[PDB]
Design a protein around this ligand. Structure first.
Ligand SMILES: Cc1cc2nc3c(=O)[nH]c(=O)nc-3n(C[C@H](O)[C@H](O)[C@H](O)COP(=O)(O)OP(=O)(O)OC[C@H]3O[C@@H](n4cnc5c(N)ncnc54)[C@H](O)[C@@H]3O)c2cc1C
Ligand SMILES: Cc1cc2nc3c(=O)[nH]c(=O)nc-3n(C[C@H](O)[C@H](O)[C@H](O)COP(=O)(O)OP(=O)(O)OC[C@H]3O[C@@H](n4cnc5c(N)ncnc54)[C@H](O)[C@@H]3O)c2cc1C
Ligand SMILES: Cc1cc2nc3c(=O)[nH]c(=O)nc-3n(C[C@H](O)[C@H](O)[C@H](O)COP(=O)(O)OP(=O)(O)OC[C@H]3O[C@@H](n4cnc5c(N)ncnc54)[C@H](O)[C@@H]3O)c2cc1C
Ligand SMILES: Cc1ncc(C[n+]2csc(CCOP(=O)(O)OP(=O)(O)O)c2C)c(N)n1
Ligand SMILES: Cc1ncc(C[n+]2csc(CCOP(=O)(O)OP(=O)(O)O)c2C)c(N)n1
Ligand SMILES: Cc1ncc(C[n+]2csc(CCOP(=O)(O)OP(=O)(O)O)c2C)c(N)n1
Ligand SMILES: [Mg+2]
Ligand SMILES: [Mg+2]
Ligand SMILES: [Mg+2]
Ligand code: NA
Lengths: 585, 585, 585
């Protein structure tokens, strides 16, 4: 006969399969808390120490599983703390439901304590943004918000006056539509469009296949197409790992969180097949200014012809379309272009291994990442923060289709390393999970290291302490006329921070200390979280976008200073390999 | 002849007298950084570790000095991190200028990296919210934003595309209007309205004068009026300290961050003179349901008759109007009502002293605050966070007109203790500054303990570790039907957190440890920041809004359990004193 | 080599096939007017008399053709006048581009004449809402707006500083992606979900197929499935005409702009197949409270299970799914349910024909729509305003698949009759076009009757003058305790309004004047616009949602009065026909 409205709201979340959700209580959301408390055997509440970590972990849930993440904040400051995690979910287009506390309906608009019109605050980030005003329709409003966040891959926000979840409604006033749920229909490739695209692709002299995370279910077809037709592969940085990094013709990503072979090859390419890719640097970096033909495959009609004048655009699923190209082609023999790029990838990987393999001396970021590779399991998950770690992880981690890695891709909010790792261990308790974060990014969310201890989530946290905002210092070096400001700062000993939250931790500053510390860490993390604070040098990572290696384009003085600064004496420009195989630059 | 637009923007801030500002750099605000770097001898940049601390310190600057606070964030996540500090400035109505980074105008609306339409994000919090599009008008736009934030006591937000501060403009394209600045005109009291108000006030049998921070310049007239006419005084919690807490007829504040005498007297009063007061609990708690006449003094026409049916409302400056009442009255003799309230305040202060004066045993919050009182200088400044510390600081600190204390009053964002103390020490390097914060509030902004070390700001930080969100646990006790959830959590050793940021710290858990630790702390803080982590009991502070003391209204079983739980065996209800002097309840 | 940015913007519109666009000039949009002036041979500019008519005609263009409608307004008041047409496009989910004037970039944020931040004005209505700040990226921002408006079936708004279109840019700063636009090839519906839906529909004893405009391409399959399986059809009001109104088992629409058979049968049905339908009265009128199984076909995942607990929801195209069902069913012999419904429809249409066929007397709305039916061409287009005309046109117009009718379906803004008829005639100069509007609705946009004369658009305008807001008076009769207010008003003689804009017109008030006047109007509209002002009675149309015809549910006194008032003496309740074919109510 009757149920409390708050109890029916928790049953709609259970019907939709939500296992865990994040937040911090307050008087303005204590009736939802009361409903959660009764349901604690069926749905699991994760209490965080700052609400932005709860919204960031909810977005990381949806990034990892495809299932909607759920978080909440109390009225006023609880909900405004959620913003960096909600803009991350909007920009990385993943479904998140956020519930916002509000004063009871009898006190709304009376200007009472911590009571304000909360609806204008969430209007820009959310796909659906409503204040609930009736208890009997509140299960439907929650159901409606989840359906929309899934269908539209964005954020749904509901402000709930605290009195409505304590009202009784009838058990027939409500249902969940979770059993009717379906994912959007995938469009099929037009065969004539595929034939025309294939003919342009085969006629190319210097082809590249450039794919994003829209080609996630097509790693087999990508690799197979590359080796049948002898066409090198390059990706956006989030798409690393779709094709194994060891694959000999994988060039890496372009621009700054980039690898040298991809930047050099893109400038020479005559035809690019751009697949499931919304690379945000296309126009501002003039990435395709020398491309003769640009071919596109994407599921979304708003992306077709968006990033560059597009000669043939196919509106279709990436995997279905690459299976259709592959059904029309045959093995081609090796070309000068194929061989020139293979030799260039070999030269680059030998430069990265030489940085990784130093055995003694002052610790640099390169050897830390080599030690992570040594203890990493084949299906490890990586939550990466924002700064030089995106550049260094992209060059040094060796990923396969069995791994997962997540960061804040487009909004690029620092602080995501710790919440992403909490969400990862909750969803995959049996996989090894790492959190790789710079010292500026780990100190923004450092208080939630205690959430890994409190909920027994064994994460290997690795902090790269350079006592700098290193990614911004290198920008100021490049653009600013006056001296550095706001980029070098005081030390924080993170092994002491970890001790304060009662987590095991180590601090290291020499290359020869790494093997034993990472061995111990790997063993601790079978049961408990652990933190390694690696005190690294201030050395700038080689800028793949400002290469000074080619004598035809840089002075001998610039080239020698570049090689000395980046320990790059053995790198050769792509033009060397192009000339060995008879091609021009 | 020419100046860079970024250099002219920094000269407008210097003309307006800004000494320091807060933020974290990023590529999207590196041209403002470049201008700051050149001006580092004239204006001082405070680099924080999380941008919400920079916006909260900027609001605390304006709360302490009356001068506009200034903060900035880089594009996307830098600026959204500012929100809890910007909503605090809006709700506590203090002037703050926030500068938001944005991608260059050639890349805007291209959907490039970390580039979005940033103007809708700040539309609800700001009084002035504009994206600058021209370099020659940018000094004027900054000048315009400061004039408006001052005149309107709110937030001005300017989004600046990174290319405009690097453009050259002519040194005649700009001026600052800082030398024309004036504060708003104060309206004068109508003499007839003052006479009518005074006659109602003198005819009252049980009068109360109830004032807020709008009566800040009138503490002398408030005390003088109270003792000439024999009328007890009560205030809003922010107004504590306008009249010395030792004054015998100061009753305290009402509702929950309240003192028992003010709650008991307000329920009996027949006439209330409500002066410079916008108490947000008036209507929802039915605070004035028994008041016969309600008299109001305020400078703002939007507040007149707002909180209760008002019999005589005077639109005028609080001090001028109280000086005018005082010029029309003469000494009155003692009354039963005056004496009944004096005896009630005496009984209450003896209960607080008995909690404070325990000499040995398990540490409670009451003795920690007694030890703060013992080392506190007469003009100390207190930055207080949000939770039980507002209730306990309000009852136990003894303030005079020489002290200052700040918290987030109406938005009530946790985490303000640390940024408020940083702003206080920057503005008053010669005054002793304390940061009193609960463990849930101090862990939200704990990373910026390093900002007090880095900029050598000697703050005495006191953390009250109860391993609870104690203020929310007591609410769940009062309203929730099911068991506690999300309010008891794991320990964080804050003396270890402080060691990790290289600050001296102590952890204490017994009453007898306090005198020596606070003595050492007082000595360290002549030169360096120090932190005391006080591990306190989970005891609930006496709820002044749910008193069980009067036998006419509560059962003997409820009264005895109340006295035993709150160690309140010696408190007497106000009805005892009312009956001793011949009045009825 | 160079092109002005405004000339490249008009070339992006031409590339996307925009044939005409609407607006009113002003100083802040005169550089876009300058570029249109040069291209008047390729794109036709329609100067309207009030900018809301421009925005409403642009939404009617997209409703009729599926191509993006385009309108513009000058800064400040020109753009805010667009609002009722932009909300109609958002709510009726059709693509519209709106360009908004803005003061030059050198004067923005200077608080100069008619200059304000215009971006917050359009944030709620628009899917895409940006202020352009650079001339070289302006063609791309217009291309982006058009691609997003089509992909998201909504409104895109761009605010353009007037200086930017007069700046020179290179002929390759731009391209349009119109050539990449295409329709998705959708998968066939899964045969197992189709077979489950077919088996449930065949077992039903009292089935109904209830379709909306999502089944617009399935008129053949709806009609064939209906007569093969003997299942009556009912639709939403906008879906009228998908199956010819003369089809014997078409029941009409439900609720108030409704027909009696549909309302009575919906309350009796056991299984409802809900197809391409988002009927907004479902939950608030408990339309499906007696339904036993509810089956759904929709292409949008956000709609599955939205309107009622749904037993089987198939995500698929309506026409392909109904064709798949039709391919696996065979003839069912006539059932009792089928025959009771056919008898009920016959009785209802005899009632409507008796109102239409009155030959002398005071003119009512019913005989005016019979005269419209007599001169109507089989492919005529009807633009219908909002009010009793939706109810009357839904019952009396006899449409086929060759007709089109449009109104403001969900936002329901009055005044759409004239702009919809202007847009229809611009798109189809060879088709007969009607504007049917009540006197309240026609007077909101009456000034744009001159745009039909100025651009030589031969529309037949029929105004129903009752000197009332008749739709609202009947609501006040049903809900209001006190007397009618604001619903009866002064006469406007629209044949004199038409004469003032130099349009031929007639005013009629007698049933016997109709044949000659409508015969003359049909002939004038071969070359010129014409208006007929029909002065009608204030009789209330029969309320299909408040039927008092069944003795089992209404008293005989109520049934007598209902029959008398609505001239409904020969109408029978559906229960008569149920009992006649052996079914119980
Ligand atoms: C500090 C930092 C720096 C960065 N620097 C760079 C850099 O230098 N270089 C770099 O590469 N990246 C960089 N990134 C990441 C960058 O911001 C973008 O997020 C990324 O380049 C876009 O990747 P994507 O195209 O794979 O993903 P998305 O932007 O998510 O786009 C996915 C695309 O796939 C399409 N799609 C989806 N499903 C399908 C399907 N089934 N079939 C076909 N199409 C489909 C979608 O419609 C969309 O068009 C950086 C990130 C950070 C945090
Ligand atoms: C956790 C927490 C709990 C709280 N609980 C309580 C509680 O239980 N009880 C309580 O009292 N407070 C409480 N507060 C504070 C509360 O939220 C309000 O901020 C406070 O009660 C309002 O104080 P005010 O009226 O002094 O200040 P304001 O709201 O700032 O109002 C000032 C008033 O003075 C007027 N004014 C300004 N200048 C003049 C002048 N020159 N002449 C005359 N009028 C002038 C202004 O127009 C305005 O009307 C709490 C705060 C926190 C953080
Ligand atoms: C004065 C006034 C009163 C009104 N009163 C009534 C009334 O009493 N009764 C009434 O019926 N209406 C009434 N209306 C109209 C009403 O407001 C709604 O607009 C209408 O009922 C909804 O029609 P729809 O479901 O056909 O269209 P829409 O709301 O546009 O929905 C179309 C649906 O079809 C789906 N769809 C689209 N394409 C496909 C495809 N190819 N395959 C499958 N699914 C697809 C869409 O996803 C969507 O769910 C009134 C309007 C006015 C102006
Ligand atoms: C919340 C937030 N503030 C500011 C920025 C701008 N930003 C981008 S990278 C970076 C510095 C990263 O520092 P750190 O984590 O120490 O990494 P490092 O580069 O030193 O490895 C900053 C400040 C941002 N992306 N997010
Ligand atoms: C950012 C934010 N989140 C949530 C709240 C709700 N809230 C108000 S008081 C409180 C708990 C305070 O905890 P703590 O700092 O430990 O103080 P205690 O009461 O234990 O002394 C909370 C969560 C808030 N005001 N601000
Ligand atoms: C712009 C606008 N204002 C108000 C309404 C509310 N409304 C709905 S129907 C109606 C009256 C319709 O009057 P009229 O056009 O004379 O038609 P009638 O019903 O008299 O035939 C009104 C005011 C509306 N939909 N749109
Ligand atoms: Mg760093
Ligand atoms: Mg606490
Ligand atoms: Mg009318
Ligand atoms: Na923090």
């Amino acid at each position: 006969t009757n149920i409390l409205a708050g109890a029916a709201v928790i049953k709609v979340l259970e019907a939709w399969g939500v296992d865990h959700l994040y937040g911090i209580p307050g008087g303005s959301i204590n009736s939802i808390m009361d409903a959660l408390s009764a349901e604690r055997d069926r749905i699991h509440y994760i209490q965080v120490r700052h609400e932005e970590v709860g919204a960031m972990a909810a977005a990381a849930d949806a990034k990892l599983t495809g299932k909607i993440g759920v978080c909440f904040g109390s009225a006023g400051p609880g909900g405004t703390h959620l913003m960096n995690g909600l803009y991350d979910a909007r920009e990385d287009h993943v479904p998140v439901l956020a519930l916002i506390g509000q004063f009871g309906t009898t006190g709304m608009n009376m200007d009472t304590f911590q009571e304000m019109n909360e609806n204008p605050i969430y209007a820009d980030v959310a796909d659906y943004n409503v204040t609930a005003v009736n208890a009997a329709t509140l299960p439907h409003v929650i159901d409606e918000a989840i359906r929309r966040a899934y269908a539209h891959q964005g954020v749904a926000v509901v402000q709930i006056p605290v009195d409505l979840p304590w009202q009784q409604i009838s058990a027939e006033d409500w249902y969940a539509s979770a059993n009717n749920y379906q994912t959007p229909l995938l469009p099929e490739p037009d065969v004539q469009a595929v034939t025309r695209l294939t003919q342009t692709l085969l006629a190319a002299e210097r082809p590249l296949i450039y794919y994003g995370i829209g080609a996630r279910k097509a790693g087999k077809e990508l690799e197979q197409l590359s080796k049948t037709l002898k066409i090198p592969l390059m990706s956006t940085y989030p798409a690393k790992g779709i094709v194994a990094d060891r694959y000999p013709a994988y060039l890496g990503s372009a621009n700054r969180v980039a690898q040298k072979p991809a930047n050099e090859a893109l400038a020479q390419a005559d035809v690019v097949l751009f697949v499931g890719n919304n690379y945000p640097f296309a126009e501002v970096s003039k990435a395709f200014k020398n491309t003769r033909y640009f071919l596109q495959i994407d599921i979304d009609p708003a992306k077709l012809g968006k990033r560059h004048k597009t000669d043939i655009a196919v509106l279709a699923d990436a995997q279905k379309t690459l299976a259709a190209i592959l059904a029309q082609v045959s093995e081609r023999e090796s070309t000068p272009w194929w061989q020139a790029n293979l030799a260039n990838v070999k030269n680059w990987r030998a430069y990265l291994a030489s940085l990784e393999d130093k055995q003694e001396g002052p610790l640099q970021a390169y050897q830390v990442l080599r030690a992570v590779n040594k203890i990493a399991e084949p299906d490890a998950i990586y939550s990466i923060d924002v700064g030089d770690i995106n550049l260094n992880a992209n060059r040094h981690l060796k990923l396969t289709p069995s791994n997962r890695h997540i960061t804040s891709n487009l909004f690029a909010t620092m602080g995501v390393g710790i919440p992403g790792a909490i969400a990862a261990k909750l969803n995959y308790p049996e996989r090894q999970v790492f959190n790789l974060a710079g010292d500026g990014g780990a100190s923004m969310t450092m208080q939630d290291l205690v959430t890994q201890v409190q909920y027994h989530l064994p994460v290997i946290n690795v902090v790269f302490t350079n006592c700098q905002y290193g990614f911004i210092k290198d920008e100021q070096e490049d653009t600013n006329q006056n001296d550095f400001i706001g980029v070098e700062f005081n030390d924080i000993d993170f092994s002491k921070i970890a001790d304060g939250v009662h987590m095991q931790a180590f601090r290291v500053n020499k290359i020869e200390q790494l093997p034993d510390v990472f061995e111990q860490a790997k063993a601790i993390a079978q049961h408990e979280p652990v933190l390694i604070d690696a005190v690294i040098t201030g050395d700038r990572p080689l800028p793949a976008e400002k290469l000074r290696l080619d004598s035809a384009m840089s002075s001998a003085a610039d080239i020698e200073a570049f090689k000395q600064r980046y320990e790059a004496q053995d790198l050769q420009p792509l033009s060397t390999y192009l000339k060995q195989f008879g091609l021009d630059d």
